[PDB]
């Protein structure tokens, strides 16, 4: 398996589209 | 801009819950000013820049997080932006002096391999330690379930800090293990370098 990094978008609950 | 605290995770049989503290606009503005007058609570802050968000874990009076999230950035603070106290790039580790209201964990000294990972959603999941900086997730979950958790803590059964979560070790979008920065790297950093 590979290393995956886990940053998310800005803010407390980031908006995904 | 500055890293901004946008909420927190408060730890209790280890349990956790999360609370929002900032909205997106205030997160942006506070990032530009470096000035955060909000009350801080809990062991784990949800932190964010204008572009990305992640966790920071307070161990012994320092708020630590991952370099790949925070880079060289200041932490927004009541008296203005807080300069990083420790900046360890090869170890992917940065720390700021803990905001005063923040609650510090103390490092694990018991050596248990039975760990818990506290995620960005405040779920507490079982990890078995396999070495200095890896543990397998005893119940594999989609990598999506771990998105946003960079910098969150690994804890031992006694609720002491073992490390901070760095990256998932995945096959086909299923996280089977985590890679973490050991608490020993924090003490080596505070020596040190
Ligand atoms: Cl706000
Ligand atoms: Cl002011
Ligand atoms: Cl403020
Ligand atoms: Cl930077
Ligand atoms: Cl312990
Ligand atoms: K918001
Ligand atoms: Zn322990």
PDB file of C-alpha atoms in Angstrom, chain A residues 1-16, chain B residues 18 48 50 52-53 68 120 146 148 150 165-170:
ATOM      1  CA  UNK A   1       0.000   0.000   0.000  1.00  0.00           C
ATOM      2  CA  UNK A   2       0.873   3.665  -0.534  1.00  0.00           C
ATOM      3  CA  UNK A   3       1.080   6.628   1.798  1.00  0.00           C
ATOM      4  CA  UNK A   4      -1.966   8.891   1.371  1.00  0.00           C
ATOM      5  CA  UNK A   5      -1.992  12.416   2.820  1.00  0.00           C
ATOM      6  CA  UNK A   6      -5.165  13.663   4.435  1.00  0.00           C
ATOM      7  CA  UNK A   7      -5.516  17.465   4.332  1.00  0.00           C
ATOM      8  CA  UNK A   8      -9.028  18.671   3.666  1.00  0.00           C
ATOM      9  CA  UNK A   9     -10.345  21.986   2.247  1.00  0.00           C
ATOM     10  CA  UNK A  10     -10.583  25.214   4.267  1.00  0.00           C
ATOM     11  CA  UNK A  11     -12.833  25.634   7.307  1.00  0.00           C
ATOM     12  CA  UNK A  12     -14.343  23.583  10.118  1.00  0.00           C
ATOM     13  CA  UNK A  13     -16.439  21.425   7.740  1.00  0.00           C
ATOM     14  CA  UNK A  14     -14.979  21.860   4.251  1.00  0.00           C
ATOM     15  CA  UNK A  15     -17.318  22.137   1.247  1.00  0.00           C
ATOM     16  CA  UNK A  16     -17.068  19.340  -1.356  1.00  0.00           C
TER      17      UNK A  16
ATOM     18  CA  UNK B  18     -16.166  18.024  18.548  1.00  0.00           C
ATOM     19  CA  UNK B  48      -7.297  25.800   9.044  1.00  0.00           C
ATOM     20  CA  UNK B  50      -7.561  29.727   3.629  1.00  0.00           C
ATOM     21  CA  UNK B  52      -6.556  23.592   3.817  1.00  0.00           C
ATOM     22  CA  UNK B  53      -7.594  22.182   7.212  1.00  0.00           C
ATOM     23  CA  UNK B  68       2.736  19.429   5.301  1.00  0.00           C
ATOM     24  CA  UNK B 120     -11.343  14.693  12.605  1.00  0.00           C
ATOM     25  CA  UNK B 146      -9.646   9.830   7.688  1.00  0.00           C
ATOM     26  CA  UNK B 148      -8.953  16.060   7.592  1.00  0.00           C
ATOM     27  CA  UNK B 150      -3.702  14.978   9.776  1.00  0.00           C
ATOM     28  CA  UNK B 165      -1.238  11.164  12.728  1.00  0.00           C
ATOM     29  CA  UNK B 166       0.741  11.850   9.505  1.00  0.00           C
ATOM     30  CA  UNK B 167      -0.551   9.738   6.594  1.00  0.00           C
ATOM     31  CA  UNK B 168      -2.695   6.711   5.781  1.00  0.00           C
ATOM     32  CA  UNK B 169      -1.142   3.537   4.320  1.00  0.00           C
ATOM     33  CA  UNK B 170      -3.747   2.520   1.749  1.00  0.00           C
TER      34      UNK B 170
END
